[PDB]
């Protein structure tokens, strides 16, 4: 909570930017983990079908 | 809001000649101001061409009566064709009595001041620029908007306006770089750059800054205490041939 309205608006802008950046980083790391899991599944399924 | 009436001078005159004999016709005291300063046309250096002389006085006793307040500000050169001009604000008998007294004294005759697009835009450049006590120039910016009133049949397009937020003004000058004339290189070309209209060719009615000045061709309006020096200098060159 802040008193001056300009500080309120600046903090709101910073909050929006921080939320977007955090969401993007989480998506990136989760996508990396997804890629690793998919690679493991494919490499096991290849031996299974062979 | 103070409206300024502009006016020119045919040949150079001397004004401090008889402040004692300028009062008995008017029946109250009038003071005198003698002042001259540097007006750097180029920051690197300045020749003798910027040598300017300025006079200033008033006709009043009552400081409470803010409405009945008028000032006559003089400034000009002595080596080019037109030596100087003059400006005043307010409507009263005091705005002309001295004016007749030098009507029949020096033989100089007056004429209304004409502004067109080649001059109107460049006035805001002198209005926004600031000077400190250490001779350091920094610019205080304002959200300028323009008024356009094109003459046409059927009145198909009778008035349209262009507004620029001056944070975008900040984003334009910085893109061009450090410039002493922001409206030469950041603003006026950019309107032609995007929309393709020539500001200067089109009939311009008014250039309005955000609460600092009010520029129109008929008369200049400013809410400041007194007009600055760069404004008068650029007006002088503009009315020069």
């Amino acid at each position: 909570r802040e008193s001056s309205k300009a500080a309120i608006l600046a903090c709101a802008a910073e909050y929006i930017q921080k939320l977007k950046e955090t969401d993007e980083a989480n998506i990136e790391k989760w996508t990396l983990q997804k890629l690793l899991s998919e690679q493991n599944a494919s490499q096991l399924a290849s031996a299974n079908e062979k | 809001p103070y409206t300024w009436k502009f006016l020119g001078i045919s040949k150079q005159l001397s004004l401090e000649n008889g402040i004692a004999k300028l009062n008995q016709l008017l029946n109250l005291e009038v003071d005198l101001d003698i002042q001259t300063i540097r007006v750097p046309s180029d920051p690197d250096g300045g020749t003798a061409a910027d040598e300017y002389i300025r006079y200033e006085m008033r006709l009043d006793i009552s400081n409470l009566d803010e409405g009945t307040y008028s000032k006559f500000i003089f400034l000009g050169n002595s080596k080019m064709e037109v030596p100087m001009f003059l400006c005043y604000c307010g409507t009263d008998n005091r705005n002309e009595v001295v004016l007749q007294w030098l009507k029949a004294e020096y033989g100089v005759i007056m004429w209304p001041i004409k502004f067109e697009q080649k001059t109107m835009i460049k006035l805001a450049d002198a209005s926004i620029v600031h000077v400190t006590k250490e001779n350091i120039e920094q610019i205080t910016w304002f959200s300028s908007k323009l008024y356009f009133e094109p003459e046409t049949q059927d009145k198909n397009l009778r008035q349209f306006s262009i507004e620029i937020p001056r944070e975008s003004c900040e984003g334009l000058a910085l893109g061009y770089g450090n410039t002493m004339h922001p409206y030469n290189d950041a603003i006026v070309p950019y309107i032609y750059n995007e929309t393709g209209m020539a500001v200067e060719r089109l009939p311009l009615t008014s250039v309005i800054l955000a609460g600092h000045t009010k520029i129109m061709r008929e008369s200049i309006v400013t809410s400041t205490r007194s007009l600055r020096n760069r404004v008068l200098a650029v007006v002088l060159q503009s009315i020069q041939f």
């Binding site: 309205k5 300009a6 608006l9 600046a10 709101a12 802008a13 929006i16 930017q17 | 400081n63 959200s143 937020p165 944070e167 955000a210 609460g211 205490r225």
Partner: protein, 34 residues
Amino acid sequence: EWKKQRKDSHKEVERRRRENINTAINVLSDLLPV
């Protein structure tokens, strides 16, 4: 007078404060998608 100069300074400060809010809300409206 001194009072007039103080009033002029107050007016300038008030104008700057008014313009700051407009600039901040313009930035915010820029950030919004709609």
